[PDB]
Amino acid sequence: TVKVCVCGGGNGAHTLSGLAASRDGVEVRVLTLFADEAERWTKALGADELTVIVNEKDGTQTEVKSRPKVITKDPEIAISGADVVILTVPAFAHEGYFQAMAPYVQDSALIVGLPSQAGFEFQCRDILGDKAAAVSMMSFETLPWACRIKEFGRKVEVLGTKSVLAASLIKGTAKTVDPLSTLQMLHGAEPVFRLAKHFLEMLIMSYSFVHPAILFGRWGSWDGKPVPEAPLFYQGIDQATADMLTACSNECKDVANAIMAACPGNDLSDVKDIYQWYLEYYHEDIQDDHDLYHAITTNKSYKGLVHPVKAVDGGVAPDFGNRYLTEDIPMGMIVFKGVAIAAGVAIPSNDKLIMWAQEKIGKEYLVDGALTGKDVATTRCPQRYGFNTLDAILTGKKHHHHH
Ligand SMILES: NC(=O)c1ccc[n+]([C@@H]2O[C@H](COP(=O)([O-])OP(=O)(O)OC[C@H]3O[C@@H](n4cnc5c(N)ncnc54)[C@H](O)[C@@H]3O)[C@@H](O)[C@H]2O)c1
Ligand SMILES: NC(=[NH2+])NCCC[C@H](N)C(=O)O
């Protein structure tokens, strides 16, 4: 029997629990530390089955029904004897789950971030301590489905499923269940999972600059005057933003190259240009693909998507109380920044974005090119956890001197 632990009670956690609990030979334990959410779930479900409505490519709707073994807030019941522990929550909530699982997780455990975001492995190492070298850490690039809860604790809808999905793996000393095949088995036929080459490849291929760049590209030097309707998000970028995106993508390659130079044997050669990525994964959606500006603006799977806005005097204004910045910076760019600091590479385009965007969310992270802001402790950058050098970043082992 494969014993799987699902962390969280969101859209993803609902979708994952339903599909995993339906696979024969799988026991699912659902753990949520959000107040008394676990109890609310159990009470809402009752004796009924957790229903997952999948919208297939045909237009037809497949219906999956299953019951998890237990939905508890007690980390002892959920974690003990778990072969796979999967975290499906926004990143600010990951710190709590690592602490909860710390005493009860077994050596042979496979810890999965679905999705991980950035600094997942640095955080896991810090909290689990020595045990992180035993377990295996697995980082997915994004959530496998676009999904929304239809009825809390009992009904969730898959709007669509990705076809391909990459996950990075850090193999520990202990032998786990096979990372790729076990995760595939739980998910079903789609997405088809492949292993990435390196975890830092996964970390930077997040492209944590994208949403902060689109928001800066439109509201950078905003005078305060309102607009009629909400302007288009991805498709509303000007040329200055396509150049801003390329410069940050170039800086991603810079950090990737420095690491391969400083530490050979770390294959980071799968780190691309954002222009190269778009033309590989959105090829069927792009009308005109001659540059990055046109690849994004004419991308059909971006139509109707607008900026977050709120009603103000004489129109609408940008809503900033979102997870575009309060997530992608502390749990994305700052991590990348710390890695770049350790790599000894300047990243001016990324720096410009960090400084503007932190100020919009009333937070301090980066100060004069140094990780010394007020809220630097709420970020997952490797320097925050004590890992100051590139070697400490790759291995998790800190330098101690004699004699
Ligand atoms: N939903 C999607 O289709 C979509 C698509 C791609 C990627 N993602 C990403 O995947 C991640 C997970 O998606 P989701 O929709 O399940 O997130 P979600 O918004 O549904 O997560 C909410 C859950 O997180 C936990 N939580 C929320 N606030 C908490 C707090 N204050 N303290 C402790 N726990 C708290 C609770 O268990 C809650 O049920 C997100 O970060 C999102 O960016 C989502
Ligand atoms: N998993 C990735 N490589 N993502 C790159 C694009 C990321 C970007 N933040 C988006 O949602 O479009």
Q: How far is the CA of 100 from the centre of ligand 2 (A)?
A: 30
CATH number, domain containing residue 221: 1.10.1040.10
DSSP assigned state of 221: T
Task: Compute φ and ψ for 322, nearest 5 degrees.
Answer: -130, 180
Pick from 214, 216, 204: nearest CA to 358 = 216
Strands (E), 142-241: 145-151, 155-161, 164-170, 192-195
Q: How far is the CA of 39 from the centre of ligand 1 (A)?
A: 18
Radius of gyration of the chain, Cα coordinates, nearest whole angstrom: 21
Q: Determine the structural domain holding residue 22 and report its residue range.
A: 1-205
* CA angle at 243 for the pair 242 and 247, rounded to the nearest 5°: 120
Q: What is the 3-state secondary structure (H, E, C) of 52-78?
A: EEEECCCCCEEEEEECCCEEECCHHHH
Ligand 2 is surrounded, with C-beta below 6 A, by 141-142, 205-207, 210-211
Angle between helices 210-219 and 348-360 in degrees, nearest 10 = 70
Annotated binding site: 9-12, 34-37, 117, 142, 147, 205, 211, 323
Resolution given for this structure, in angstroms: 3.1
* Residue of 94, 187, 198, 211 marked active site: 211
186 and 246 part of one domain: no
201 and 229 part of one domain: no
119 and 228 part of one domain: no
The C-alpha atoms of residue 133 and residue 154 are separated, in whole angstroms, by 37
The C-alpha atoms of residue 286 and residue 228 are separated, in whole angstroms, by 28
CATH number, domain containing residue 155: 3.40.50.720
The C-alpha atoms of residue 218 and residue 2 are separated, in whole angstroms, by 48
Counting from 1 in the atom list of ligand 2, the atom nearest the Cα of 277 is: 3
The CB density around residue 232, as the number of other CB atoms within 10 Å, is 16
Residue 323 CA: which ligand is closest? Answer: 1
Residue 249 CA: which ligand is closest? Answer: 2
Question: DSSP 3-state assignment of 16?
Answer: helix
26 and 116 part of one domain: yes
Number of structural domains, the chain? 2
The C-alpha atoms of residue 150 and residue 387 are separated, in whole angstroms, by 42
Annotated binding site for L-arginine: 205
Best substitution site from 143, 206, 301 to test ligand 2's pocket, by max atoms within 8 Å of Cβ?
206
Question: How far, in Å, are 46, 96, 328 from residue 127 at the CA level?
Answer: 35, 10, 22
* Residue 25 and residue 103 in contact, taking contact as beta carbons nearer than 8 Å: no
Residue nearest to atom 2 of ligand 2 (CA): 206
The C-alpha atoms of residue 362 and residue 373 are separated, in whole angstroms, by 11
Among candidate residues 171, 205, 239, the one where a domain is terminated:
205
53 and 151 part of one domain: yes
- Which single residue is written with the structure tokens 């202990």? 174
248 and 167 part of one domain: no
